[PDB]
């Protein structure tokens, strides 16, 4: 229940503001910057600010803080969801999120803000629906918003019915300094870019453990996602009733389902680091990377980031496979490898000097993270069974899907 949502700037200037209830004065935005500065200097800065009896909830955007001032005890989660929807709509309409587009599309930006929410209650949240009624280059509102199906616009015609799916896998491993993995969770991502004619109702079917157990086929390799979230077009009733993933696919790229469950398998890449750091004399980087993934899968664009000393200079890299580049801005050395086949063993030996004068304050030990991304690999083993594409007119669809395995929160605690 934010009183007014406004877009700020890096210098405190409000790029654009739009009051929705009028219960909060527009002059409260000026005091938001001093409050944020005081909070940052004291460690008490939070996204939800508080200016007396009015709370100024702000979200750190790409270039401006989306401050949504509120007065009463409005839904904080609702305000955050509205801000996220507004950010997504702006990203869809404008490819750049900065001051260049804030002051360049004000005529359409004001109309979009007015149409999105009224009296603090959001009304329009579909990017396609908003673009079909408000454009920067007006007819009556589309019937899709009024109709029940607000995620599948009717009347869409295409020459070919091709849908491109993406089995995105995020391998996150939380390995402590002792060598044991604490947080090892893999989050699935079933995103399909449906581009067909009409409003087909997708019938999602995969090798789900629950579905296999219900059907009596709980003996093969089935993916048991701890948390499964359906898309907006996905009908929750069918999933709760018999796990039937039946919903109208959206026009374009959208996230249908996103699995999320813990992983009990060995890490895809095993990286062991050795720190032979002398006392203000030199530093040793005994970094050894072992590929725990299958040899048939290659980790393309593998970049194992090893944090080097903050004051370290004149470093020498003695590795075997993969180029090592030291970035002064990042204050770390990334063991970048173009192609990392499974089972490969890469050994590196870093050596650099240190300044004679000791550092005044400590810099910490940031965890070492790798950027391995091996496509065409299904670590979870979940295989899609079928995709029920049904249309009233009747057409032969040719859906496609690709499985991509990447490294997410794969951070290894430093020694």
């Amino acid at each position: 229940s934010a009183s007014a949502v406004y877009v700020l700037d890096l210098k405190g200037k409000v790029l654009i503001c739009r009051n929705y209830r009028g219960d909060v004065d527009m002059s409260e935005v000026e005091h938001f910057m001093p409050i944020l500065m005081e909070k940052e200097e004291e460690g008490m800065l939070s996204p939800i600010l508080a200016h007396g009896g009015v709370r100024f909830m702000w979200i750190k955007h790409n270039n401006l803080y989306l401050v949504a001032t509120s007065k009463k005890n409005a839904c904080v989660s609702l305000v955050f969801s509205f801000l996220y929807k507004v950010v997504q709509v702006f990203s869809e309409y404008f490819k750049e999120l900065e001051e260049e587009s804030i002051r360049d599309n004000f005529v359409i930006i004001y109309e979009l803000l007015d149409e999105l929410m009224d009296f603090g209650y959001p009304q329009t949240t579909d990017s396609k629906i908003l673009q079909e009624y408000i454009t920067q280059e007006a007819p009556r509102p589309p019937a899709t918003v009024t109709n029940a199906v607000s995620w599948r616009s009717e009347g869409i015609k295409y020459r070919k019915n091709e849908v491109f799916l993406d089995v995105i896998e995020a391998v996150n491993l939380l390995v402590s300094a002792n060598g044991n993995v604490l947080r090892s969770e893999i989050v699935g991502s079933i995103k399909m870019r449906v581009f067909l004619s009409g409003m087909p109702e997708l019938r999602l079917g995969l090798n789900d453990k629950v579905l296999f157990d219900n059907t009596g086929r709980g003996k093969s390799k089935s993916v048991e996602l701890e948390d499964v979230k359906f898309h907006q077009c996905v009908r929750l009733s069918r999933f709760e009733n018999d796990r039937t993933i039946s919903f109208i696919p959206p026009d374009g790229e959208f996230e249908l389902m996103s699995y999320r469950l813990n992983t009990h398998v060995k890490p895809l890449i095993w990286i062991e680091s050795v720190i032979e750091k002398h006392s203000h004399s030199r530093i040793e980087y005994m970094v050894k990377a072992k590929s725990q993934f299958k040899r048939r899968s290659t980790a393309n664009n593998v970049e194992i980031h090893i944090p080097v000393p903050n004051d370290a200079d004149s470093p020498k890299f003695k590795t075997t496979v993969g180029s090592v580049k030291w970035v002064p801005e990042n204050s770390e050395i990334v063991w970048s490898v173009k192609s990392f086949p499974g089972g490969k063993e890469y050994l590196m030996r870093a050596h650099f000097g240190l300044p004679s004068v000791e550092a005044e304050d400590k810099e910490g030990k940031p965890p070492i993270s790798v950027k391995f991304e091996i496509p065409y690999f299904t670590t979870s083993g979940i295989q899609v069974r079928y995709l029920k594409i049904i249309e009233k007119s009747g057409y032969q669809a040719l859906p496609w899907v690709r499985y991509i395995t990447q490294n997410g929160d794969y951070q290894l605690r430093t020694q």
Binding site: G205, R402, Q406
Partner: peptide, 18 residues
Amino acid sequence: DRKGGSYSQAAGSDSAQS
């Protein structure tokens, strides 16, 4: 070709489930 795994054809439903 495409990085991150080549696109593969998908079926319509579980033919073995009737």
